[PDB]
Design a protein around this nucleic acid. Structure first.
Length: 164
RNA sequence: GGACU
């Protein structure tokens, strides 16, 4: 149970991911891909090569919740077939043309009320819920946060661990 | 910095 999760969380770097809509997170859950803006895309590629795992912790903006977490399985790829993202106003397809493959670790939600005790030393010790897209979460805070999520009754950590 | 609370 936790032994497999804790294994996957070991050596990890944790990034907060924000989405302006629910639909992109749902497409991401369904297809196992994500795109972020260029600045974070660069930070994520770099992180991928420095840690056994990079964990993306998803939160839809103004939702009052996290919607789950995933592990990067690839660096971003460009020049492939574009994802049908819902593009917030002023944002172009080109800005989210970097496509990362991800393997979901937990598709279950976690209301911010359940993480209120966790603060992030890498964001001025603000509660972990507060953070821009791509904000890195310190090791202890990130690990403990992921551990708060309800167990995902439908993901078998065999393949995820297999890949690593 | 063009998907913080």
């Amino acid at each position: 149970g936790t032994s497999k999760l804790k294994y996957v969380l070991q050596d990890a770097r944790f990034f907060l991911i924000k989405s302006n809509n629910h639909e992109n997170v749902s497409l991401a859950k369904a297809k196992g891909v994500w795109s972020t803006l260029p600045v974070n895309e660069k930070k994520l590629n770099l992180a991928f090569r420095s840690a056994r795992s990079v964990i993306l912790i998803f939160s839809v903006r103004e939702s009052g919740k996290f919607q789950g977490f995933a592990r990067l399985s690839s660096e971003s790829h460009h020049g492939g077939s574009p994802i049908h993202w819902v593009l917030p106003a002023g944002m172009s397809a080109k800005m989210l043309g970097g496509v990362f493959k991800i393997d979901w670790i937990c598709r279950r939600e976690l209301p911010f009320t359940k993480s209120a005790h966790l603060t992030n030393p890498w964001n001025e010790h603000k509660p972990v819920k507060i953070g821009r897209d791509g904000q890195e979460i310190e090791l202890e805070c990130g690990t403990q946060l992921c551990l708060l999520f309800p167990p995902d009754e439908s993901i078998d950590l065999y393949q995820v661990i297999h890949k690593m």
